[PDB]
Design brief:
Blueprint (H helix, E strand, L loop, with lengths): L1 H36 L6 H30 L5 H35 L1 H7 L2 H24 L8 H8 L10 H31 L3 H37 L6 H13 L4 H4 L4 H11 L1
The ligand COc1ccccc1OCCNC[C@H](O)COc1cccc2[nH]c3ccccc3c12 binds next to helix 2, helix 3, helix 7 and helix 9.
Family: Belongs to the G-protein coupled receptor 1 family. Adrenergic receptor subfamily. ADRB1 sub-subfamily.
GO molecular function: beta1-adrenergic receptor activity; identical protein binding
Protein name: Beta-1 adrenergic receptor
Length: about 290
Amino acid sequence: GAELLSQQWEAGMSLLMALVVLLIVAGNVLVIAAIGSTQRLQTLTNLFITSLACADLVVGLLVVPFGATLVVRGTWLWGSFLCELWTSLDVLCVTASIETLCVIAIDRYLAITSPFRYQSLMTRARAKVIICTVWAISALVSFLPIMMHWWRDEDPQALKCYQDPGCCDFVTNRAYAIASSIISFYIPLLIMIFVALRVYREAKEQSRVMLMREHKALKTLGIIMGVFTLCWLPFFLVNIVNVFNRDLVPDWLFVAFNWLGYANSAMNPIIYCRSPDFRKAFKRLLA
Ligand SMILES: COc1ccccc1OCCNC[C@H](O)COc1cccc2[nH]c3ccccc3c12
Ligand code: NA
């Protein structure tokens, strides 16, 4: 009865979760194998795309599976330490993603306003240093505050969760909710939007078939940026609203918005099918 409902729901939800995991992983392996085996896809810009695929891969392999076992079994099975590690990895991947999108926007702005300065300034070795720098900064603002417990609240319902090994709710104090949201998300979001609008203005101020092909590619990048925003902004708006008033937004919708964020990790591989070169490498690799 209660037990039959539980069996039906657990089995259906395990299946949906396996699908999501599979889509995230297969799609981002494909992006990475495509770029890694197609000389024509090995541009500097695509080094940043690979990094973005690595963040989404880590969400497919680690973040979503743990989150799935929690949603399905209705308890955390893995101990306190893995709860904190899982949370740190979650925060890391969102931070690395939006910082990397920001870099991509800046790379394109430079290329479109100073193609020659771009040429002498930007090399493989420098792109790699930029990628490492993004992951370094992202790890810094993710792991250390979570591992030093700067996020913990003193409310008794929070302390209840922190003491129960089967609770892995990321219940935070307000200061951390604000500061961490601004540092990991809002600041790079704003930078990315400001730069992406400038790139649009510059594109509008611009042989003909080659200019077309570039503009198709710029719009692809513009779409991954806009869809990332659409997928995560609702979550981070509710995160701030909750600080000021917990009743304005029902909890089920806050949770749904987190899952929409996770869903973003399956979207870029599909969006890259707008490109002939990606489409051809995908077809070939699936052989
Ligand atoms: C809504 O909770 C969940 C329910 C079921 C399964 C997984 C769930 O996710 C719990 C962890 N999700 C974290 C979110 O997936 C990512 O949240 C963040 C990413 C980057 C910086 C951040 N700064 C912050 C301050 C407060 C809350 C979140 C963040 C945060
Ligand atoms: Na706990």
